Structure 1
């Protein structure tokens, strides 16, 4: 499965090894993200709480609480100062990380808010809901700027591209959708011949590629500009849950994903080969994240497991 990097690294395979296990959530873990400054890891969970731990030592930092029901997603401001969380209480919350204080509640969705990100400028927040819409919010006012009639089933994931000019969305209706932030227009619908529910989507770090997970045990690399699926990733288990997935780019080029067999899967991006399967979880691995500068994976498992795990690699 070796990958070609530079001279004398013709055969790079990653070697992630579990370093820390992070414990405290009293229910299913839902989302874990590294802060852009790589100093912190935020997690959300069905226990209604968001926790902050050290990205390198995994030591517990704090509890941020306020949501009246469970939490499906969490996202950092571009300066690592603010959090946005998405909840079963139909709202999102904006948090100052230093004080742990709720800055804004974002009210307007009529159902569970499943997913959230800030744009790179971090003046804007996108969210997907069980209400079947995608919403665009002003970070500094709480105003819903736009409601997009995005899909015809709950909205699984949303994300902003490199300059924040586009939003990618996915849903259970079998659709990945690209919207113009400025205009609220649908610019692309991406779909292959089959139409399985779309459990996840994210733009690659340079905006040129999209990574979609579908509930037929598959991840796909799409070229956005062309509507062309380019690479497919299989071998793992994804038929029920909306698992987070990732480009790993600090080392070799990998695709990292949780799987429903309790493993973290990692693949050669180029050749699609499975290069590593990571053990330690005892329930479905629902979320994974990749550290901004170190070869560090954060994993998080479901209700029978309740733990976050941090693995470390040399590439």
Structure 2
């Protein structure tokens, strides 16, 4: 069994490198962030441009949705995160505290908290309602490449160029576990038992969190430079999805570790991929020679 992702839409409009694409939890929208300082909202199913959300003074490296699909958070080189009302496009809160570029962000499942990672080497936990910083974790000794909450928000996982992945107790801010090439991306599996980690030696690893053991390795792609997003595809077959510095989207069989598809079409590094929550749909986005988002559809 292999997927058969085919190109459905090319989304043009960002004037510099795209940095991150994320599907709304309700499956309706794609949000994109860019070095052009803009967030753009697109129809997930028809690829139709919806709106531009603006206000950051420098490039945006990441964007994330609240669980109810009503809010976005963005992470910017202007050293702030911003919370946006998607319907109005208005900035509700500017989260101030990082002393350098904010690189990565995510809401917890409740969406009362935001976690951020920065070049300042810290992870911050923010109150969504007040916009106040609740905790500053001295998480790493180099830029923080990724931050993600587990399924119930009890844990945070962070990755860094220092070569560490760390698991934090959300409530206390205390480090429960440390798992050395730079770690360029990390996220929990949907069930929260595993962590998917990218290292800048062209390697993805599936870690059993509780055991601290490497279960799977995915190779064949190019990743020596950029913090490329990877995903668990769960809507059809159980795949691993990642961009690559050879301008392709890679899809592996999670269990066998075999490459089952490579998606051709991008004309620069595929920095970000996202899996639709209910349909067999991938969004991919590329750096400044390309600046487009592609939507792909598969039968499985």
* TM-score bracket for the superposition, by shorter chain length: over 0.9
Q: CA deviation at 1:255?
A: 0.2
Q: CA deviation at 1:199?
A: 0.3
Instruction: Give the distance between the partners of 1:248 and 1:272, measured in 2 at CA.
Output: 14
Aligned to 2:160: 171
Instruction: Give the distance between the partners of 1:160 and 1:76, measured in 2 at CA.
Output: 13
Q: 1:25 aligns with which of 5, 14, 18?
A: 14
Show CA shifts across 1:35-90 (max 9, x none).
Answer: 00000000000000000000011010000000000000000000000000000000
2:55 maps to 1:70: no
Normalized against structure 1, the TM-score is what?
0.95
Instruction: Give the distance between the partners of 2:213 and 2:54, measured in 1 at CA.
Output: 42
Q: CA deviation at 1:166?
A: 0.2
Aligned to 2:147: 158
Q: CA deviation at 1:94?
A: 0.1
Instruction: Give the distance between the partners of 1:238 and 1:56, measured in 2 at CA.
Output: 30
Instruction: Give the distance between the partners of 2:226 and 2:254, measured in 1 at CA.
Output: 23
Instruction: Give the distance between the partners of 1:226 and 1:93, measured in 2 at CA.
Output: 36
Q: CA deviation at 1:167?
A: 0.1
Q: CA deviation at 1:129?
A: 0.1
Q: CA deviation at 1:133?
A: 0.2
Q: CA deviation at 1:251?
A: 0.4
Instruction: Give the distance between the partners of 1:175 and 1:18, measured in 2 at CA.
Output: 36
Q: CA deviation at 1:276?
A: 0.2
Instruction: Give the distance between the partners of 2:151 and 2:232, measured in 1 at CA.
Output: 14
Residue aligned with 2:223, SS = coil
Show CA shifts across 1:265-287 (max 9, x none).
Answer: 00000000000000110000000
Show CA shifts across 1:232-274 (max 9, x none).
Answer: 0000000000000000000000000000000000000000000
Instruction: Give the distance between the partners of 1:206 and 1:134, measured in 2 at CA.
Output: 23
Q: In the comparison of the two structures, how many residue pairs are matched? A: 300
Q: CA deviation at 1:217?
A: 0.1
Instruction: Give the distance between the partners of 1:239 and 1:150, measured in 2 at CA.
Output: 23
Q: CA deviation at 1:24?
A: 0.2
Residue aligned with 1:306, SS = coil
Where do 5+ consecutive residues of structure 2 fail to align?
none
Q: CA deviation at 1:103?
A: 0.3
Instruction: Give the distance between the partners of 1:87 and 1:279, measured in 2 at CA.
Output: 30
Instruction: Give the distance between the partners of 2:257 and 2:248, measured in 1 at CA.
Output: 17
Residue aligned with 1:229, SS = strand
Q: CA deviation at 1:130?
A: 0.3
Instruction: Give the distance between the partners of 1:279 and 1:13, measured in 2 at CA.
Output: 16
Aligned to 1:147: 136
Q: CA deviation at 1:91?
A: 0.1
Instruction: Give the distance between the partners of 1:114 and 1:60, measured in 2 at CA.
Output: 25
Residue aligned with 1:99, SS = coil
Show CA shifts across 1:6-56 (max 9, x none).
Answer: xxxxxx210000000000000000000000000000000000000000001
2:267 maps to 1:282: yes
